[PDB]
């Protein structure tokens, strides 16, 4: 990396070290702060270095402007690199062993009082940080974020296009509306009555581009969302769209693995070898949501087998319904971390979420000092629950009973409860420092609402290859047939998702037929391409702003975006979306 | 490049060579054509290879489907690589020394009669090629084009982000309208009365991002244009937007040079070391347009000095007006290449373009057999015009007289006439196989119309650093002051352009003041960033579709685009822009 080059400058401010002692250099940057007549600190985007204000008869004309420069202004300074006298060194900053002795200077631009503290990476005000964003970008935070994004994305670009031979293909933005997932933004055309609509994602051209050769396609595409429901999320975001020809699920499953591994920032942590997978059934059961945390490690396990006996009233009626069961989660070290008080909050959480009894069994630590109903369970099944739940010296097992799904959802939310609990007043088991990736496969193909069941709906995408599994459960009993759709989850977030799009229009035809007709208006152009010898093809979308936010550890995805828009568009920096004089509506309608 | 990998396949169809003899391989692809029971040819995106239909008792079930596959369908075929028997070899194709012997097969997808010839890279019907585009993409032409684009662009991405340390920064698309250059597309927002507008180019954020640190910015941005007149080339196109901090003109002048050199496709021709530059004055004078061909070399030169004497009536009145002059161009070898007939077309071209007498002087070859008026000029000034025009054995000089600008424009278009003439019925002096680049600097800062001169206008961009040159010609006599704006021209095209945007709002203020006021509504947010200590900064835009078209030698820029739109939007493949039921206008207005 040449860095500062093709410019009048040498050696960006922060790169100077002892190696540069004695070297003549002319560097330019911003004025951070100074102490009276003695000091100056220049700051580039990179680091910052210390410039000593020359005090002399010959250098007085230089000292003039160097001390006349306002708060943070742009100055070019030329001089020689010298080592800081004696123990003046500042190990806290990289340039700290050296200072720069001015020869000449000049004032590139001045500035007025700026309502921001650039030193501390500002302070948290969204309104102000955004209104002044061109200022805020100077902060080392925005700098680190945007530079990370650029870097990592470009390394992905390398992994795909250079390494594995994809092609960077730009699909058009302004296009026709395909109302499968959600409604789209409209864009009036000069020709009256007819107008384009921004795409939700380049999933339309996903099939076509695969039909047209191009064995490997990839794009970073700007996708747009008009959201009636949540004014919070961005009006536009960025996705890495990947599509491959002649590939199974396991293949692209490895593709994203190698992609994230190669692209991983190298600054913070490595990533891991192939990501553990799981089935929609298995995550929904053993976690309680399809997007679990997984670094947590608090597992839902089924102990019902030891409860066949023990006719205690609670578990009795639980084992009754043919769909009923009794499961549990084990919170580690919770035996003594949480006070005996805040477990009553866990019990109270029953009331919050779909009220159901949760039983705090202490089978080892604080034993007999707790567990009023569970004292019998402890004194009866202790060793067995030690084996099953796999507990430790100080541990506590939350024990619930009811329907499979109901109890799974319960313990699922409740382990999160144990997270946000055990982290305060103690150790935190979930740190934004480390990362856990999990594959979620075998999702349902169809789901019933919002019209009265069943007009169904497409699970995720209208065209999704069903896990072959006789394939016919489609016709026999839909919603009972699964798909090849997959989701990548990173630390409880959906980082990306996709499916194996289905070829051979024969299959497509009737799925669209049960779903609805006259949709053939829209999609006959696509199914046509299906009858033109479309190859088997599948791919995945990767939310970029999401992944980059997650990796930078930012509070919101607006910290990983150059000029984001808070709260239903409305960029706070410039007035927009704004009105406009009527004669500007004239060329359209 | 791993190429075919992460998939069930080995060895993409076209890569197989003698090196692969005996290697077991399973490859999948498209069926191009076959001869009866004997032959098959599979085609990947890459090359194509020859599959021999096995005829046997054990292989009959394979021969069944392999001969049952329709015209062009998708088949996977597994077998062993063998050499073609004896002299069956086909040196015309890369896989031609080998064929592939089937072991097993299967039919991935079939197809119906497709109204296209994929072998010959179709035939020219824009309507059909576009309507069926997902088909047309299979053609080796679209393949080469899109793959070239992806490749080269990605290498530019390397040169900037990897090599010289730029940052890839996505500026928002939906935004507020800044009606400097042209009107923009509008996009209705869920909140009634106020709506966004697509950007013409990320030139807005060009200043801000430079204010905010990020010493080097770059982006490939989708720029949307709406031109009511003249609407031929499509609404959206790709640009490479570059902006640097603390850089002169000469710097980025070298930047784009290194960029194009590093990025040059390597397939066709090298590029050249630093591009020859020229001044707007000099190109307009010695070429006749700011975008000359330069590989051509037919120069406009001023011979008026030898015409002070020689009171011949024609040149007489020409030397009369204080702004009048008599200039000429010399077409080489034209003396005998063109017939004595088609020079009457050059003379007739007077009538076509702003009718003015052009005089075909033959001063050497076919002498005295031509030049009715010019025979005197020849017999008088011959040696002198030999020196001046620098002619050769067989040469002919086109001689015109009139206003400086008028005659310059004339000979400017007329050398192109001599190009398209001398190339047919003879040698072609302009070959796409070679590229010529030229820098055009020192453009005017201001130009008078369309309101009555002078309400002026911004030459190119409102904020453009004037070539310092006392700077004050702004106030004294505007339109007489030049700028630092630059244009890159490649083979008579404007490949890219930009300027050094101006810092220090002091200067900006009055330029915007003379131009117009209440524009401060829009741009006070920008000039604010000018008073916040914006560094000196400058950059350039690079038309991507243009450059890629020019390098691939395509007829139109729609051959370098995945899914282009011909003739005022209207993608021919899908119906768009289209109308839409009234209740879909309801959420907006």
JSON list of C-alpha atoms in Angstrom, two decimals, chain A residues 1 147-168 216 218-220 240 242 255 258-264 266, chain B residues 1-3 6 150-151 153-166 168 218 262:
[
{"chain": "A", "resi": 1, "resn": "UNK", "atom": "CA", "xyz": [0.00, 0.00, 0.00]},
{"chain": "A", "resi": 147, "resn": "UNK", "atom": "CA", "xyz": [-12.02, 1.79, 6.16]},
{"chain": "A", "resi": 148, "resn": "UNK", "atom": "CA", "xyz": [-12.75, -1.70, 7.51]},
{"chain": "A", "resi": 149, "resn": "UNK", "atom": "CA", "xyz": [-15.82, -2.01, 5.30]},
{"chain": "A", "resi": 150, "resn": "UNK", "atom": "CA", "xyz": [-13.90, -0.95, 2.18]},
{"chain": "A", "resi": 151, "resn": "UNK", "atom": "CA", "xyz": [-11.00, -3.28, 2.98]},
{"chain": "A", "resi": 152, "resn": "UNK", "atom": "CA", "xyz": [-13.00, -6.40, 3.83]},
{"chain": "A", "resi": 153, "resn": "UNK", "atom": "CA", "xyz": [-15.45, -5.99, 0.96]},
{"chain": "A", "resi": 154, "resn": "UNK", "atom": "CA", "xyz": [-12.56, -5.61, -1.46]},
{"chain": "A", "resi": 155, "resn": "UNK", "atom": "CA", "xyz": [-11.03, -8.83, -0.07]},
{"chain": "A", "resi": 156, "resn": "UNK", "atom": "CA", "xyz": [-14.32, -10.62, -0.72]},
{"chain": "A", "resi": 157, "resn": "UNK", "atom": "CA", "xyz": [-14.17, -9.17, -4.22]},
{"chain": "A", "resi": 158, "resn": "UNK", "atom": "CA", "xyz": [-10.75, -10.82, -4.46]},
{"chain": "A", "resi": 159, "resn": "UNK", "atom": "CA", "xyz": [-11.93, -14.19, -3.11]},
{"chain": "A", "resi": 160, "resn": "UNK", "atom": "CA", "xyz": [-14.79, -14.38, -5.61]},
{"chain": "A", "resi": 161, "resn": "UNK", "atom": "CA", "xyz": [-13.53, -12.68, -8.77]},
{"chain": "A", "resi": 162, "resn": "UNK", "atom": "CA", "xyz": [-9.77, -13.28, -8.52]},
{"chain": "A", "resi": 163, "resn": "UNK", "atom": "CA", "xyz": [-9.59, -16.54, -6.62]},
{"chain": "A", "resi": 164, "resn": "UNK", "atom": "CA", "xyz": [-12.69, -18.57, -7.53]},
{"chain": "A", "resi": 165, "resn": "UNK", "atom": "CA", "xyz": [-13.50, -16.93, -10.85]},
{"chain": "A", "resi": 166, "resn": "UNK", "atom": "CA", "xyz": [-16.87, -15.25, -10.44]},
{"chain": "A", "resi": 167, "resn": "UNK", "atom": "CA", "xyz": [-18.00, -12.31, -12.58]},
{"chain": "A", "resi": 168, "resn": "UNK", "atom": "CA", "xyz": [-19.04, -8.91, -11.30]},
{"chain": "A", "resi": 216, "resn": "UNK", "atom": "CA", "xyz": [-20.38, -17.91, -11.32]},
{"chain": "A", "resi": 218, "resn": "UNK", "atom": "CA", "xyz": [-21.61, -12.06, -7.95]},
{"chain": "A", "resi": 219, "resn": "UNK", "atom": "CA", "xyz": [-22.66, -8.48, -7.27]},
{"chain": "A", "resi": 220, "resn": "UNK", "atom": "CA", "xyz": [-22.72, -5.92, -4.49]},
{"chain": "A", "resi": 240, "resn": "UNK", "atom": "CA", "xyz": [-23.53, -9.26, -1.66]},
{"chain": "A", "resi": 242, "resn": "UNK", "atom": "CA", "xyz": [-24.02, -14.71, -5.06]},
{"chain": "A", "resi": 255, "resn": "UNK", "atom": "CA", "xyz": [-18.38, -21.01, -0.47]},
{"chain": "A", "resi": 258, "resn": "UNK", "atom": "CA", "xyz": [-14.18, -19.68, 2.56]},
{"chain": "A", "resi": 259, "resn": "UNK", "atom": "CA", "xyz": [-15.42, -16.18, 1.74]},
{"chain": "A", "resi": 260, "resn": "UNK", "atom": "CA", "xyz": [-15.83, -15.09, 5.36]},
{"chain": "A", "resi": 261, "resn": "UNK", "atom": "CA", "xyz": [-12.58, -16.79, 6.36]},
{"chain": "A", "resi": 262, "resn": "UNK", "atom": "CA", "xyz": [-10.57, -15.09, 3.63]},
{"chain": "A", "resi": 263, "resn": "UNK", "atom": "CA", "xyz": [-12.30, -11.78, 4.22]},
{"chain": "A", "resi": 264, "resn": "UNK", "atom": "CA", "xyz": [-12.06, -11.77, 8.02]},
{"chain": "A", "resi": 266, "resn": "UNK", "atom": "CA", "xyz": [-7.33, -9.97, 10.49]},
{"chain": "B", "resi": 1, "resn": "UNK", "atom": "CA", "xyz": [-8.17, -19.08, -10.68]},
{"chain": "B", "resi": 2, "resn": "UNK", "atom": "CA", "xyz": [-9.81, -22.27, -9.39]},
{"chain": "B", "resi": 3, "resn": "UNK", "atom": "CA", "xyz": [-12.69, -21.81, -11.82]},
{"chain": "B", "resi": 6, "resn": "UNK", "atom": "CA", "xyz": [-17.26, -25.86, -5.09]},
{"chain": "B", "resi": 150, "resn": "UNK", "atom": "CA", "xyz": [-15.86, -7.79, -14.55]},
{"chain": "B", "resi": 151, "resn": "UNK", "atom": "CA", "xyz": [-12.17, -8.62, -14.84]},
{"chain": "B", "resi": 153, "resn": "UNK", "atom": "CA", "xyz": [-13.07, -3.32, -13.27]},
{"chain": "B", "resi": 154, "resn": "UNK", "atom": "CA", "xyz": [-11.87, -5.66, -10.52]},
{"chain": "B", "resi": 155, "resn": "UNK", "atom": "CA", "xyz": [-8.26, -4.91, -11.50]},
{"chain": "B", "resi": 156, "resn": "UNK", "atom": "CA", "xyz": [-9.00, -1.19, -11.17]},
{"chain": "B", "resi": 157, "resn": "UNK", "atom": "CA", "xyz": [-10.47, -2.00, -7.77]},
{"chain": "B", "resi": 158, "resn": "UNK", "atom": "CA", "xyz": [-7.10, -3.58, -7.00]},
{"chain": "B", "resi": 159, "resn": "UNK", "atom": "CA", "xyz": [-5.04, -0.64, -8.29]},
{"chain": "B", "resi": 160, "resn": "UNK", "atom": "CA", "xyz": [-7.00, 1.84, -6.18]},
{"chain": "B", "resi": 161, "resn": "UNK", "atom": "CA", "xyz": [-7.92, 0.01, -2.97]},
{"chain": "B", "resi": 162, "resn": "UNK", "atom": "CA", "xyz": [-5.10, -2.53, -2.70]},
{"chain": "B", "resi": 163, "resn": "UNK", "atom": "CA", "xyz": [-2.22, -0.73, -4.37]},
{"chain": "B", "resi": 164, "resn": "UNK", "atom": "CA", "xyz": [-2.70, 2.99, -3.76]},
{"chain": "B", "resi": 165, "resn": "UNK", "atom": "CA", "xyz": [-4.89, 2.80, -0.67]},
{"chain": "B", "resi": 166, "resn": "UNK", "atom": "CA", "xyz": [-8.22, 4.32, -1.62]},
{"chain": "B", "resi": 168, "resn": "UNK", "atom": "CA", "xyz": [-14.58, 2.06, -1.40]},
{"chain": "B", "resi": 218, "resn": "UNK", "atom": "CA", "xyz": [-13.32, 5.83, -4.88]},
{"chain": "B", "resi": 262, "resn": "UNK", "atom": "CA", "xyz": [-2.65, -1.55, -14.74]}
]
